RNA sequence: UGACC
């Protein structure tokens, strides 16, 4: 059930770009203090984005290539949606002022007070452990 | 494909601008095109760059181009990654961490003093840097940082 | 030369 791995990956290019745009738009207005309706900005972005990419062949084209690739190579559905959600959440957070340094460290470590002491306890989470099994700079 | 991905990314920016700009007008709120254009552009450029997401799609577009030039190595890697038995578990843990983020000040103060976050050019993932002392200490278990050291580093 | 935050 992985015989569409390339097409699934290729769609995240369109979908993640779309999500980036919604975030950019809603976030900018928000930073201006202007009140707005999420669905309204969401719909306007989709209207413009869909018209340009989905009517100029640049989605039918990318997908077509992805399909040509999957045939040559020839479930995976769940891990692809989650891949897309990771891009979305990161961007949503990024837009709010919680950059990468904050996200990486907060996700890689848990920190505790330590009661009758003037120090903190740091522990690696599963994400940090996997990085070690891969690569962390000494 | 890479040029198409770039194209799609720019069309996305155009959409964010038209959405904000058209949203202000529909609500009877004045605005200068250049002003709104600039605001959306800083946010979009910052978001796409800081998220590592720009590198993700341009990177993905590049492995398709390669597969089109008969170098399926990367595409093969893409299928194996998505097929890994623990892929969903790993992304779920990833996604869960980020969603809980939507405090952390004290936590960041301590962390900002012991670790540095970097990025390998082109990559969407990150690189964490520390001292061999910390690394070896971490590669053993819990680690106590003294509130004095942190302060020694702002 | 994306693979994870």
From Swiss-Prot, chain B:
Origin: domain of life: Viruses
Locations listed in the record: Host cytoplasm
Region RNA-binding: start-end pairs: 1-140
Family according to the record: Belongs to the rotavirus NSP3 family.
Subunit structure: Homodimer. Interacts (via the coiled-coil region) with host ZC3H7B (via LD motif). Interacts with host EIF4G1.
Function: Plays an important role in stimulating the translation of viral mRNAs. These mRNAs are capped but not polyadenylated, instead terminating in a conserved sequence 'GACC' at the 3' that is recognized by NSP3, which competes with host PABPC1 for EIF4G1 binding. The interaction between NSP3 and host EIF4G1 stabilizes the EIF4E-EIF4G1 interaction, thereby facilitating the initiation of capped mRNA translation.
UniProt protein name: Non-structural protein 3
């Amino acid at each position: 059930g992985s015989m569409e791995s390339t097409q699934q990956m290729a769609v995240s290019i369109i979908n993640s770009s779309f999500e980036a745009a919604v975030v950019a738009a809603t976030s900018a207005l928000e930073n201006m203090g202007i009140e707005y309706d999420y669905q309204d900005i969401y719909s306007r972005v989709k209207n413009k984005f869909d018209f340009v990419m989905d009517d100029s062949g640049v989605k039918n084209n990318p997908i077509g290539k992805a399909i040509t690739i999957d045939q040559a190579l020839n479930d995976t559905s769940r891990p692809a949606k989650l891949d897309e959600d990771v891009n979305k959440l990161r961007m949503m957070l990024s837009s709010k002022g919680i950059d990468q340094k904050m996200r990486v460290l907060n996700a890689c470590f848990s920190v505790k007070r330590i009661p009758g002491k003037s120090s903190s306890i740091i522990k690696c989470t599963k994400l940090m452990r996997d990085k070690l099994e891969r690569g962390e700079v000494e």
